[PDB]
């Protein structure tokens, strides 16, 4: 369908840590979603060699927003070509499976 | 109109007294008259007034440019001719093609040679396939090559294979003290997958200081351009037997396919010109005119030869005036230093007729096997045989790329 | 032969005349560097005072 | 210092092509500036009648497009200014002055020639 | 011996001055044994014309070098082009002492070709450098679509890279382009707030005007430019305190004409004093194999260091260029211009003469504004 | 396609008189002309190129002048061993004829 | 290489016959053949290239041919149908280059004739 | 999963049936539809801990933290470091956690 920018409202942990953060570290923000619900990795893309970021990364690398404040997860290959800040949560992977 | 061809000084003789009446182009629009011209002298003013006298009389704008050997200034010669005609001049052998390069801006010229990267990517699949990771790379002072090596790297970080560069190596070789220096680094080059960016004076001398040295030994693996090769019918007996090199289809696309192969090209464009617009281009009056009104037809010509859809084959040009879609010729160095055709890249697939790298290396005497021949037989789970990635071409790094060697039943 | 050496020490036996050269050989394949460590016996050094400049 | 010299004709005949002629001295100034055409009218109006540079930029008043143009040639260190549309009342007295970059200033002058037509 | 010397030159009086710069240079430098004689061949309106003239009389008479300047009409740049081609074609060493334009710059093709004074791309070298004297560690880099624009971005980018001071970011743009308001739109929102720019007369013009539409001429936004754009008519349109460039006396023509024949004179004597070197091509008509001397007489003009220069230390690079040249920013102030840095070659230091900066800057600014 | 029409209708001169026949086109040529000669029931022989260029064989009896659209061909000085009709040829497009005219002796 | 007619005819009056014109290369060289009318004009009939295409006629006989040929043969394929009002002398001709353009010949046939 | 070449046959049976949210492949699960599911411990342990219809199982492994990423250049790293650190330390993050 055609995907409209509407506006929402947004709140949660990574809303909260933001906020304090701005309200510590002077200076003003603005938040809008990822365009297509995707955590950011390597892909091909028009079929050529190169491989490169898509969704979630690849917005952050094209320099339309200038940070991210979500769940991501820290690796080398996100680590070569972006800036991690130090962890505010260390965590792990888990399976869920029906009780 | 007409397709005029030129025979200038050592043009192919045979090439004409026997092939000027094979010429067949109907079942099209156009009816262009086949004109040769032989010139027996490299003089300049000669064919400089000859295609001034075409376009003051012959109203010829297709112009098969069939001749040789030398010097790719002479094509820009052929571009102030292409600045005062805005015609399509095509570049067929040497002086023409196969020694052209980086065309100008206001070039209305044209060639079927590849592009520096084109056959630079043409390479980096022959190592591809032959799991070459590793890979130094060298070249000289001939300009020409900070494009080339800009391409490869390009390639080389756009692309997911593990490529491993050891250093890019810039040659001043004219240099007289230079070369007391370049031991230096020639000496510290330990990577046995080297390519190699230079011209055959270059190519030459450069062989001898790696010789001298020890870089033309058992291992030692060279990638050239076809620059380095010059004329590969005067075979250098002094270059090293087991040199891998890459060249246009010489001795299979021969001159009379070509300069045929050109006029067809030529009428299909004019045959699109005929069909879109519906107007035959017009010469100008004299040769020290100058006008600009053929403008939006100018660019537009090149649109409809920009898009050949001829032969069934969509050959049509890439924007720089090459072609898209390049056939090329890898040939290695025979027992008596000849060189014969190994590789075959045809629509962007790359063949080989000895799979097998053969081991083609200086003929050192007969040595401790340490490359050994290792028969496999397929059994769950000790030996499992399964199907290459096309993209990597290769499979998981536990993975061994075995070639399955089918004995052909009835072939 | 020496471009094949993986090692990062040396032990040498030579005399003089083509130790130099040898060394100088080392420096142009960049044998001659920080990391590496080069062990002779007496008869290299020679005198101790006839030095050579390619040590 | 610098300067710029003018002539012409003087004598008028009908259905002619008017050359004014200016040349800069003192120095080879052929390959910089703006160089600059102007009439003047006995009523002490002025409006220019061309401004050329040192590559073929002619612009003017688009009263006469078809009728001025300037023929530059800088082996003589020379140019015309070729008037047309001249009849009988077109006597004026016309200059020849240079650009100076940024319109920082109209001061190196002509000293002006008098077009006379009878 | 008698070598021969050509010039393509239409200007009469440096003809005859041309001609007695030969004679004092024969004189001064010593011509005892090379008689070294001038000739000289109108400039036409058509290119043909050229071709036809330099194979009939010049490369007929075997002439070494064709002394060429800038044609008189700097829209056809090409004319030059065909005397290129045609040096080019037997491998003829040919010295144009007033050309800049990139197109001769690549030595793929013109590698017969030498100029003597250097090219607009070598412009770019200075701003770096005179970045250095300020450390503006943010700069938007704004350039046309032309072999020009494509070796000044290059050359560039490539020196900027090394100090690890990189372009922010770099514009692209065709000339003759309609409007630019909304490429310096995406420029004005980066943080930057130092532009470089590199156009023609009507591009320059065209981004002057689009600047001055929406505000960027004021203050912080800091502009840098060259020489091309401080000519023509883009100040009847560009603001104030503009910084362009100005490399050293490249105007004049006579002294480069005195220097290039002593450059001249000198290679050759001391180069014939040496080898068994092939006479000259014969001519247009009846020669089938090129000159192969070319590439050694290049080798010469190359180590040539004509120190003895009539302007000075006069010394050709790697490349066919005299490096070290005093260039001086040209400081916009008040539609006037104003020598206030110098540059020896080593570094631009500003003399004593107050820099006005862009949007009535008094002082040094900021490079950037923080978001 | 385009047509032609030769004209006219007539080659009456003597022994060594002088006559003249045009090639005139439908549309413009630029200088495409050809000549032919033939007895009745005999065959055709060449006279005249783009340049009214005559072939070995043909002696200079036979010349012409013409441009764009129309030419002129005169013959002179002819011996009565030509008896024939002449003809022009045009292939602007694949082919095209015109009339002609035959040769009589009076 | 030399050129023969064969097949000349009109027995039957607005009938069909196929005319054609042996050569003894050819390979590469086109056609087109000739009629003359009683007023001895050689007028054209068909025309062919070397590789069999471009099949047209003159606006005189447009209508009622069909045309074709055999190269390997050296022979041409042409059915005269509206040559009914005339005794028509007919010749081949071979247009000399050959090509897919046409030019100046000096090799034609030898001649046969079709009477009514 | 994919980095990990002798579990490549693991990528191979997901990459069949894999999702693109969170939440779809979580009631997808609710639903029995996909056998179990495969991601962090701090959505899962939340999403377990909220219904009472799921759970987490087996042993957390690759131990990673996250973490707010910033383009190399940006001048906001070391600052944005050193006050989540001064957040870990003062408790507000215990409260935020809470
Ligand atoms: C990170 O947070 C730091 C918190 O102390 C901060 O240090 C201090 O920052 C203030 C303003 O941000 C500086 O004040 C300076 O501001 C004016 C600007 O006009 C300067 O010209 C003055 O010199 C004035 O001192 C403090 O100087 C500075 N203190 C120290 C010790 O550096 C950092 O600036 C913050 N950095 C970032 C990148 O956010
Ligand atoms: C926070 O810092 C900014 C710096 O841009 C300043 O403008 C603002 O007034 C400050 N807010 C305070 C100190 O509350
Ligand atoms: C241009 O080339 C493409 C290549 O497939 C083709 O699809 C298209 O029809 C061509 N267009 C014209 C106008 O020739
Ligand atoms: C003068 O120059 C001409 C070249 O046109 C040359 O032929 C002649 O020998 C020269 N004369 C002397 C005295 O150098
Ligand atoms: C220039 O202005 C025109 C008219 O407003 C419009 O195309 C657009 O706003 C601008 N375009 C560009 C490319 O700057
Ligand atoms: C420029 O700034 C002035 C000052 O506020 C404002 O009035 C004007 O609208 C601005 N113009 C543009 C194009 O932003
Ligand atoms: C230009 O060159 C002349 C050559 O003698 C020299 O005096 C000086 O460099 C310049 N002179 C003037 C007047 O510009
Ligand atoms: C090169 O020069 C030397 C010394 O002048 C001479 O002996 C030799 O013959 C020259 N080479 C040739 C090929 O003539
Ligand atoms: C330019 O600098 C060089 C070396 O610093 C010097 O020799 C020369 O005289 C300078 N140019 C002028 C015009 O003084």
Not at chain 2, 195 to 205: G, P
Not at chain 2, 243 to 262: H, K, M, N, Q, T
Not at chain 5, 152 to 166: D, F, V, Y
Not at chain 5, 213 to 222: E, F, H, P, Q, W
């Given at each position: 369908s055609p995907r409209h920018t509407v506006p929402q409202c947004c709140y949660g942990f990574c809303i909260d840590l933001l906020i304090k953060l701005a309200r510590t570290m002077n200076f003003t923000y603005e938040v809008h979603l990822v365009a297509d619900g995707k955590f950011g990795t390597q892909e091909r893309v028009n079929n050529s060699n190169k491989k490169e970021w898509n969704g979630m990364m690849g917005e952050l690398l094209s320099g339309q927003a200038d940070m991210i404040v979500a769940p991501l997860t820290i690796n080398n290959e996100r680590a070569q070509y972006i800036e991690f800040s130090k962890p505010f949560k260390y965590q792990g992977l888990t399976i869920l499976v029906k009780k | 109109i007409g397709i005029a061809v030129i025979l200038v000084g050592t043009s192919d003789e045979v090439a004409i007294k026997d092939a000027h009446e094979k010429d067949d182009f109907h079942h099209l629009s156009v009816v262009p008259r086949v004109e040769l011209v032989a010139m027996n002298e490299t003089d300049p003013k000669s064919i400089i007034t000859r295609i001034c006298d075409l376009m003051s009389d012959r109203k010829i704008q297709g112009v098969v440019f069939a001749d040789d050997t030398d010097q790719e200034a002479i094509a820009q010669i052929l571009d102030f001719i292409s600045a005062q005609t805005l015609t399509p001049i095509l570049g067929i052998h040497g002086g023409s093609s196969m020694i052209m390069a980086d065309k100008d801006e206001s070039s209305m010229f044209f060639q079927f040679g590849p592009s520096i990267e084109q056959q630079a990517s043409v390479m980096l699949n022959i190592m591809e396939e032959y799991d070459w990771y590793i890979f130094s790379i060298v070249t000289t002072y001939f300009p020409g090559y900070q494009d080339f090596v800009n391409k490869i790297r390009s390639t080389i970080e756009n692309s997911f294979v593990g490529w491993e560069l050891e250093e890019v190596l810039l040659l001043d070789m004219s240099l007289d003290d230079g070369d007391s220096k370049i031991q230096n680094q020639l000496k510290?080059?330990?990577?046995?997958?080297?390519?190699?960016?230079?011209?055959?004076?270059?190519?030459?001398?450069?062989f001898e200081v790696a010789n001298?040295?020890?870089?033309?030994?058992?291992?030692?693996?060279?990638?050239?351009?076809?620059?380095?090769?010059?004329?590969?019918?005067?075979?250098?007996?002094?270059?090293?037997?087991?040199?891998?090199?890459?060249?246009?289809?010489?001795?299979?696309?021969?001159?009379?396919?070509?300069?045929?192969?050109?006029?067809?090209?030529?009428?299909?464009?004019?045959?699109?010109?005929?069909?879109?617009?519906?107007?035959?281009?017009?010469?100008?009056?004299?040769?020290?005119?100058?006008?600009?009104?053929?403008?939006?037809?100018?660019?537009?010509?090149?649109?409809?030869?920009?898009?050949?859809?001829?032969?069934?084959?969509?050959?049509?040009?890439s924007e720089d005036g090459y072609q898209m879609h390049p056939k090329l010729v890898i040939i290695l160095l025979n027992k008596e230093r000849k060189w014969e055709r190994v590789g075959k890249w045809k629509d962007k697939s790359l063949q080989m007729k000895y799979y097998v790298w053969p081991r083609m290396c200086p003929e050192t005497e007969e040595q401790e096997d340490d490359h050994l021949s290792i028969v496999t037989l397929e059994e769950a789970p000790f030996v499992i045989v399964e199907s290459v990635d096309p993209l990597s071409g290769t499979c998981m790094?536990?993975?061994?790329?075995?070639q399955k060697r089918i004995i052909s039943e009835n072939k | 032969q020496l471009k094949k050496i993986h090692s990062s020490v040396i032990l040498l036996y030579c005399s003089k005349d083509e130790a130099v050269l040898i060394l100088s050989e080392a420096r142009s394949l960049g044998l001659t560097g920080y990391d590496f460590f080069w062990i002779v016996p007496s008869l290299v050094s020679g005198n101790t005072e006839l030095i050579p400049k390619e040590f | 210092d610098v300067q710029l010299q003018e002539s012409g004709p003087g004598l008028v005949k009908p259905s002619q092509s008017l050359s004014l002629t200016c040349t800069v001295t003192g120095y080879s100034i052929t390959s910089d500036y703006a160089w600059n055409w102007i009439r003047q009218?006995?009523?002490?109006?002025?409006?220019?009648?061309?401004?050329?540079?040192?590559?073929?930029?002619?612009?003017?008043?688009?009263?006469?497009?078809?009728?001025?143009?300037?023929?530059?040639?800088?082996?003589?260190?020379?140019?015309?200014?070729?008037?047309?549309?001249?009849?009988?009342?077109?006597?004026?007295?016309?200059?020849?002055?240079?650009?100076?970059?940024?319109?920082?200033?109209?001061?190196?002058?002509?000293?002006?020639?008098?077009?006379?037509?009878? | 011996k008698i070598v021969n010397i050509g010039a393509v030159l239409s200007t009469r009086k440096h003809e005859q001055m041309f001609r007695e710069a030969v004679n004092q240079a024969n004189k001064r430098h010593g011509s005892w044994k090379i008689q070294l004689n001038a000739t000289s061949v109108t400039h036409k309106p058509n290119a043909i014309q050229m071709a036809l003239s330099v194979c009939e009389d010049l490369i007929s008479s075997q002439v070494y070098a064709i002394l060429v300047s800038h044609p008189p009409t700097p829209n056809d740049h090409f004319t030059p082009t065909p005397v290129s081609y045609t040096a080019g074609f037997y491998r003829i060493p040919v010295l144009g002492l007033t050309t800049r334009m990139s197109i001769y710059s690549d030595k793929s093709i013109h590698l017969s070709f030498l100029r003597t004074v250097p090219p607009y791309s070598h412009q770019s070298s200075v701003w770096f450098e005179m970045m250095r004297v300020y450390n503006w560690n943010?700069?938007?880099?704004?350039?046309?679509?032309?072999?020009?624009?494509?070796?000044?971005?290059?050359?560039?980018?490539?020196?900027?890279?090394?100090?690890?001071?990189?372009?922010?970011?770099?514009?692209?743009?065709?000339?003759g382009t309609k409007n630019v308001t909304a490429?310096?739109?995406?420029?004005?929102?980066?943080?930057?707030?130092?532009?470089?720019?590199?156009?023609?007369?009507?591009?320059?013009?065209?981004?002057?005007?689009?600047?001055?539409?929406?505000?960027?001429?004021?203050?912080?936004?800091?502009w840098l430019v060259g020489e091309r754009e401080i000519s023509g008519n883009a100040?009847?349109?560009?603001?104030?305190?503009?910084?362009?460039?100005?490399?050293?006396?490249?105007?004049?023509?006579?002294?480069?004409?005195?220097?290039?024949?002593?450059?001249?004179?000198?290679?050759?004597?001391?180069?014939?004093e040496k080898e068994n070197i092939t006479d000259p091509p014969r001519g247009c008509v009846g020669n089938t194999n090129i000159w192969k001397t070319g590439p050694l007489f290049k080798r010469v003009l190359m180590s040539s260091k004509y120190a003895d220069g009539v302007t000075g230390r006069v010394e050709f690079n790697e490349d066919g260029d005299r490096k070290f040249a005093n260039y001086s920013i040209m400081n916009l102030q008040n539609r006037k211009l104003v020598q206030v840095g110098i540059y020896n070659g080593t570094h631009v230091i500003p003399n004593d003469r107050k820099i006005i900066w862009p949007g009535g800057e008094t002082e040094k600014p900021r490079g950037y504004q923080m978001s | 396609?385009?047509?032609?029409?030769?004209?006219?209708?007539?080659?009456?001169?003597?022994?060594?008189?002088?006559?003249?026949?045009?090639?005139?086109?439908?549309?413009?040529?630029?200088?495409?002309?050809?000549?032919?000669?033939?007895?009745?029931?005999?065959?055709?022989?060449?006279?005249?190129?783009?340049?009214?260029?005559?072939?070995?064989?043909?002696?200079?009896?036979?010349?012409?002048?013409?441009?764009?659209?129309?030419?002129?061909?005169?013959?002179?000085?002819?011996?009565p061993e030509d008896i024939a009709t002449y003809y022009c040829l045009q292939y602007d497009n694949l082919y095209t004829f015109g009339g002609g005219t035959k040769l009589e002796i009076k | 290489v030399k050129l023969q007619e064969s097949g000349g005819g009109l027995v039957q009056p607005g009938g069909s016959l196929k005319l054609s014109c042996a050569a003894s290369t050819f390979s590469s060289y086109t056609m087109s053949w000739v009629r003359q009318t009683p007023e001895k004009r050689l007028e054209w009939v068909a025309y062919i290239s070397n590789g069999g295409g471009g099949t047209y006629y003159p606006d005189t006989v447009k209508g009622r041919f069909t045309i074709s040929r055999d190269n390997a043969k050296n022979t041409l394929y042409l059915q005269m149908n509206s040559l009914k009002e005339d005794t028509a002398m007919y010749y081949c001709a071979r247009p000399s280059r050959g090509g897919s353009s046409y030019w100046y010949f000096d090799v034609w046939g030898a001649g046969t004739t079709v009477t009514v | 999963f994919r980095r990990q070449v002798e579990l490549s046959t693991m990528y191979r049976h997901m990459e069949k049936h894999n999702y693109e949210s969170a939440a779809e492949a979580i009631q997808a699960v609710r639903d029995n539809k996909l056998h179990a599911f495969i991601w962090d411990s701090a959505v899962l342990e939340f999403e377990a801990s909220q219904k009472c219809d799921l759970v987490t199982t087996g042993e957390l492994f690759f131990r990673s933290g996250f973490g707010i990423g910033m383009r190399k250049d940006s001048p906001w790293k070391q600052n944005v470091s050193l006050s989540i650190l001064k957040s870990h330390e003062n408790g507000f993050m215990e409260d935020l956690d809470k």
């Open positions: - | 510290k080059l330990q990577s046995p997958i080297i390519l190699l960016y230079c011209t055959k004076e270059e190519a030459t001398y450069i001298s040295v020890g870089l033309t030994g058992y291992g030692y693996t060279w990638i050239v351009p076809s620059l380095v090769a010059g004329d590969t019918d005067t075979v250098p007996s002094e270059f090293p037997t087991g040199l891998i090199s890459v060249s246009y289809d010489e001795w299979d696309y021969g001159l009379p396919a070509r300069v045929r192969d050109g006029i067809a090209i030529i009428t299909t464009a004019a045959s699109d010109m005929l069909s879109e617009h519906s107007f035959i281009p017009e010469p100008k009056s004299s040769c020290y005119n100058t006008h600009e009104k053929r403008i939006y037809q100018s660019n537009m010509l090149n649109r409809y030869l920009i898009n050949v859809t001829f032969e069934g084959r969509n050959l049509s040009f790094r536990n993975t061994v790329p075995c | - | 009218f006995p009523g002490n109006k002025l409006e220019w009648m061309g401004y050329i540079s040192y590559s073929g930029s002619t612009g003017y008043n688009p009263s006469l497009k078809s009728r001025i143009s300037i023929t530059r040639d800088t082996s003589k260190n020379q140019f015309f200014l070729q008037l047309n549309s001249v009849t009988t009342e077109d006597t004026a007295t016309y200059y020849c002055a240079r650009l100076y970059y940024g319109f920082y200033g109209m001061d190196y002058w002509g000293q002006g020639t008098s077009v006379t037509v009878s | 943010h700069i938007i880099l704004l350039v046309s679509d032309d072999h020009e624009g494509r070796a000044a971005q290059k050359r560039l980018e490539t020196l900027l890279e090394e100090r690890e001071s990189k372009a922010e970011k770099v514009l692209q743009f065709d000339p490429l310096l739109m995406e420029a004005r929102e980066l943080e930057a707030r130092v532009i470089i720019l590199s156009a023609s007369e009507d591009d320059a013009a065209t981004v002057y005007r689009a600047a001055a539409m929406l505000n960027m001429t004021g203050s912080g936004y800091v100040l009847r349109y560009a603001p104030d305190g503009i910084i362009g460039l100005q490399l050293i006396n490249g105007k004049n023509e006579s002294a480069h004409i005195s220097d290039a024949v002593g450059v001249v004179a000198q290679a050759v004597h001391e180069l014939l | 396609d385009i047509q032609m029409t030769q004209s006219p209708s007539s080659l009456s001169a003597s022994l060594g008189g002088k006559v003249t026949i045009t090639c005139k086109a439908s549309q413009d040529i630029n200088k495409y002309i050809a000549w032919y000669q033939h007895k009745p029931g005999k065959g055709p022989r060449l006279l005249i190129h783009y340049t009214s260029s005559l072939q070995p064989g043909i002696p200079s009896r036979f010349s012409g002048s013409g441009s764009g659209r129309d030419y002129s061909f005169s013959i002179s000085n002819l011996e | - | -």
